[PDB]
């Protein structure tokens, strides 16, 4: 019965309508975000603020710079990346180019063991890399892209406030991250490095986009996690001395909602994802968006649909009932389907399911709902930052460039398009250019290191 397939699809639509956010909902989220951002910048409310607005000590005038060979480290995902990057004088300023690169999978027992284990592993990887390229012992300036909330005292010194994205290594929170890295390198003792700069991935991304676009003063990550940085007026950065020029601020907007600010928008699936995560009650805005959580959100929606007898004859496979089994890349692949249902079919088949045609269509709709809410929620955050910037500055029309990295933004067929449209609706009187970084974290880390060096 085509009539009863259609009836199944109308029921699915009623359940899926819960993910809708209206323009006014997004404006409410945006205003709330802006409020928390104000609170994060002020000495009086900083400690209470869920959105920390952390000074990076990356400034508008980095005085000068330096050229030569730079090593970049990137820790923040399931993979740890080492690369050699060359920084050199161009016609606009410094260019940077990725030349030798290697990536290492972090063992499970290193991300959730002790900080000694984690940083020992990192030091081992740095040795392996320097071996493969004979650039060993030698001393090189090292830039560390370290994609977790850090309270900086300077560019080369900052403490880990808390792990995010499933990181749980004991003995790291409250300690100087550069210190933890130097200590581990010294314990191995088979090379020496000049640790010159530590930066957030958002910041690395913004920096890497400058040489090509000097209007880039926002960096955004929509990958495993979700965060943004931007160039704030020094007069508004109350935690740092001085009123002149600008400093990059790491919003850590992922923790937005951790004081209840998103409560009316959270769905059962969100509560379930939060509760089975490594950091329950934390990073709640990020959990609506980030790749670490998106596929899992879809899996939970599909389980609700099977339990309602609307999908897969009401039976869920072992794989479908396995945590993390619906990968976030499957969300993108499903929404890449050209209409013949082939891509969707093959995903669900490899998950042990026997999908029908309408099963495939419902799974598409489930993915679209989760990823569209992610796009819309993210848009409210970026719009809040950009509207903030426009007001802080002297601008009837603000023209700004946003530098972006992360697999969700880059590889999802329609996230990007839905995101841009929503951001534009919320930012009248702004002309926003989006740029995707190419090796943003590696080249960014090198460029900041060149300045600090």
Ligand X SMILES: OC[C@H]1O[C@H](O)[C@H](O)[C@@H](O)[C@@H]1O
As to burial, measured by CB atoms within 10 angstroms (0-12 exposed, 13-18 middle, 19+ buried), residue 286 is buried
- Binding of ligand X at residue 225 (CB under 6 A)? yes
176 vs 227, which CB is nearer to ligand X? 227
Q: Which residues pair with residue 232 across a beta bridge?
A: 247
- Binding of ligand X at residue 335 (CB under 6 A)? no
Give the C-alpha separation, 340 to 332, whole Å: 16
CB of 196 to K ion, least distance (A): 24
CB of 316 to ligand X, least distance (A): 30
3-state secondary structure of 116: helix
Residue in 8, 52, 120, 201 annotated catalytic: 201
3-state secondary structure of 117: helix
Closest CA to 65 of 97, 88, 92: 88
- Binding of ligand X at residue 252 (CB under 6 A)? yes
**Among ligand X, K ion, none, what binds residue 237 when CB lies within 5 to 8 Å by partner kind?**
K ion
229 vs 426, which CB is nearer to ligand X? 229
Taking CB under 6 A as the criterion, which residues in 27-86 touch ligand X? 76
Q: Is 165 among the residues known to form the active site?
A: yes
Give every CB contact of residue 431 below 8 A, 6+ residues apart in sequence. 397, 398, 399, 400
3-state secondary structure of 78: coil
Tokens 């950009």 — which residue?
386
- Binding-site residues for substrate sit at 147-148, 164-165, 200-201, 227, 252, 286
Bridge pairing between strands 141-146 and 194-199: parallel
Q: Is 136 among the residues known to form the active site?
A: no
Residue in 52, 165, 287, 416 annotated catalytic: 165
- Binding of ligand X at residue 295 (CB under 6 A)? no
29 vs 334, which CB is nearer to ligand X? 29
Number of residues that bind ligand X (CB under 6 A): 18
94 vs 227, which CB is nearer to ligand X? 227
CB of 275 to K ion, least distance (A): 39
**Which among 12-20, 66-74, 232-240, 394-402 is the span making contact with K ion, rule CB under 5 A?**
232-240
Give the C-alpha separation, 114 to 122, whole Å: 13
Q: Dihedral sign, CA of 377, 380, 386, 392?
A: negative
CB of 396 to K ion, least distance (A): 26
Q: Which of 96, 147, 369, 437 binds ligand X (CB under 6 A)?
A: 147
Give the C-alpha separation, 259 to 403, whole Å: 29
* Total residues found in the chain within this entry: 453
**Among K ion, ligand X, none, what binds residue 225 when CB lies within 5 to 8 Å by partner kind?**
ligand X
- Binding of ligand X at residue 254 (CB under 6 A)? yes
Closest CA to 209 of 198, 199, 220: 220
**Among K ion, ligand X, none, what binds residue 49 when CB lies within 5 to 8 Å by partner kind?**
none
**Among ligand X, K ion, none, what binds residue 296 when CB lies within 5 to 8 Å by partner kind?**
none
Q: Which of 40, 141, 143, 149 binds ligand X (CB under 6 A)?
A: 149
Put residue 252 in one of left, alpha, beta given phi > 0 → left and psi -120 to 50 → alpha. left
CB of 162 to K ion, least distance (A): 25
- Binding of K ion at residue 237 (CB under 5 A)? yes
Give the C-alpha separation, 164 to 171, whole Å: 15
Closest CA to 143 of 86, 181, 198: 198
C-alpha pair distances (Å), 180 with each of 75, 119, 254, 282: 13, 7, 25, 24
Q: Which of 110, 142, 193, 221 binds ligand X (CB under 6 A)?
A: 221
Q: What token pair was written down for 154? A: 């300077």
**Which among 118-126, 197-205, 230-238, 346-354 is the span making contact with ligand X, rule CB under 6 A?**
197-205
Active site residues: 165, 201
Residues of this chain that interact with K ion (CB under 5 A) are: 234, 237
Residues of this chain that interact with ligand X (CB under 6 A) are: 76, 147-149, 164-165, 200-202, 221, 223-227, 252, 254, 286
């Amino acid at each position: 019965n085509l009539y009863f397939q259609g009836m199944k699809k109308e029921k699915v639509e009623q359940i899926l309508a819960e993910f809708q956010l209206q323009e006014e909902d997004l404006k409410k989220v945006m205003r709330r975000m802006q409020k928390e951002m104000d609170r994060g910048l002020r000495l009086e409310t900083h400690e209470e603020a869920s959105v920390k607005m952390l000074p990076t000590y990356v400034r508008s005038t980095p005085e000068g710079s330096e050229v030569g060979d730079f090593l970049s480290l990137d820790l923040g995902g399931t993979n740890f990346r080492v690369m050699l990057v060359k920084v050199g004088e161009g016609e606009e300023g410094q260019w940077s180019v990725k030349t030798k690169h290697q990536m290492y999978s972090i063992p499970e027992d290193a991300m959730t063991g002790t900080a000694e284990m984690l940083f020992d592993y990192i030091s081992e990887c740095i040795s392996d890399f320097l071996d493969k390229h004979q650039m060993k012992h030698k001393k090189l300036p090292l830039g560390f892209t370290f994609s977790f909330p850090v309270r900086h005292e300077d560019i080369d010194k900052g403490i880990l406030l808390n792990w995010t994205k499933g990181f749980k290594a004991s003995g790291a929170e409250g300690n100087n991250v550069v210190g933890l890295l130097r200590d581990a390198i010294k314990r191995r003792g088979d090379f020496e490095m000049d640790v010159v700069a530590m930066v957030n991935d958002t910041v690395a991304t913004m920096i890497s986009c400058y040489y090509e676009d000097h209007q880039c003063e926002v960096g955004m990550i929509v990958g495993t996690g979700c965060n943004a940085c931007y160039m704030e007026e020094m007069q508004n950065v109350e935690l740092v001395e001085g009123d002149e020029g600008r400093m990059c601020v790491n919003t850590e907007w992922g923790a937005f909602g951790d004081s209840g600010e998103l409560d009316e928008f959270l769905l059962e699936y969100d509560r379930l994802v939060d509760e089975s995560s490594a950091n329950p009650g934390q990073q709640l805005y990020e959990k609506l968006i980030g790749g670490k959580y998106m596929g899992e959100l879809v899996r939970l929606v599909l389980l609700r649909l099977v339990d309602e007898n609307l999908l897969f004859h009401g039976e869920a496979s072992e794989q479908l009932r396995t945590r993390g089994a619906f990968e976030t890349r499957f969300v993108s692949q499903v929404e890449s389907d050209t209409g013949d249902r082939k891509q969707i079919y093959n995903i669900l088949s490899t998950l042990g399911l026997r999908p029908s045609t309408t099963d495939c269509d419902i799974v598409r709709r489930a993915c679209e709902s989760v990823s569209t809410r992610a796009a819309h929620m993210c848009s409210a955050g970026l719009a809040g930052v950009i509207n903030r910037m426009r007001e802080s500055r002297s601008e009837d029309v603000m023209r700004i460039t946003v530098g972006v990295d992360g697999s969700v933004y880059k590889l999802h067929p329609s996230f990007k398009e839905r995101f841009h449209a929503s951001v534009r609706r919320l930012t009248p009187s702004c002309e926003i250019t989006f740029i995707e970084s190419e090796e943003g974290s590696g080249r960014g880390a090198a460029l900041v290191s060149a300045v600090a060096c």
